[PDB]
Amino acid sequence: GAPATVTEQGEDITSKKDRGVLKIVKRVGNGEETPMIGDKVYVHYKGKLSNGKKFDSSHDRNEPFVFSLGKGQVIKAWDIGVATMKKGEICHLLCKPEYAYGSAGSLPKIPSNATLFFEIELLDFKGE
Numbered sequence: 323g324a325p326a327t328v329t330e331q332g333e334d335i336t337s338k339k340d341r342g343v344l345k346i347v348k349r350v351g352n353g354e355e356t357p358m359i360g361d362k363v364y365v366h367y368k369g370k371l372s373n374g375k376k377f378d379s380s381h382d383r384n385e386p387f388v389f390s391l392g393k394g395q396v397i398k399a400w401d402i403g404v405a406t407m408k409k410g411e412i413c414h415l416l417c418k419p420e421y422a423y424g425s426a427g428s429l430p431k432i433p434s435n436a437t438l439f440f441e442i443e444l445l446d447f448k449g450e
């Protein structure tokens with residue numbers, strides 16, 4: 323499924339090149355430039371465990387998810403992944419636990435040492 327496709331075909335977008343965050347662009351965005359640090363970003367997302375078990379989707383509640391990029395307001399994989407996106411883009415990310423919830427997890431939905439899959443749509447962003 324989608325997570326395996328990211329394992330096989332995803333680009334390693336980590337600074338360390340440790341495959342901790344792997345990315346596939348599923349829909350090219352028409353925005354010209356990536357957001358800057360501190361920019362307010364607006365996204366929709368789906369989150370699943372790497373085995374395909376869904377844990378959340380912003381669409382369930384018709385609520386864009388909003389945060390300031392590159393400030394540690396979200397798990398590391400998201401600061402890394404969203405920094406690579408263009409407005410209008412949809413990507414798939416596969417995120418090793420080091421770049422997500424680590425050994426603690428986020429119980430009940432996310433176990434210890436979980437690799438996470440996300441689909442992320444960058445709806446918009448605005449300058450810091």
Ligand SMILES: CC[C@@H]1CCCC[C@@]1(O)C(=O)C(=O)N1CCCC[C@H]1C(=O)O[C@H](CCc1ccc(OC)c(OC)c1)c1cccc(OCC(=O)O)c1
Pocket residue numbers: 367369377378387389394395396397398400422423428431432
């Ligand atoms: C277990 C699933 C998780 C449960 C809390 C709500 C979000 C959640 O359902 C989820 O899908 C998730 O895993 N998210 C939400 C979408 C962005 C990616 C990811 C996330 O980063 O959630 C954080 C969780 C708190 C957090 C912040 C920073 C961290 O490291 C720098 C971190 O490391 C483990 C953990 C999040 C971020 C912002 C808002 C969140 O909830 C709403 C709120 O607090 O207003 C939740």
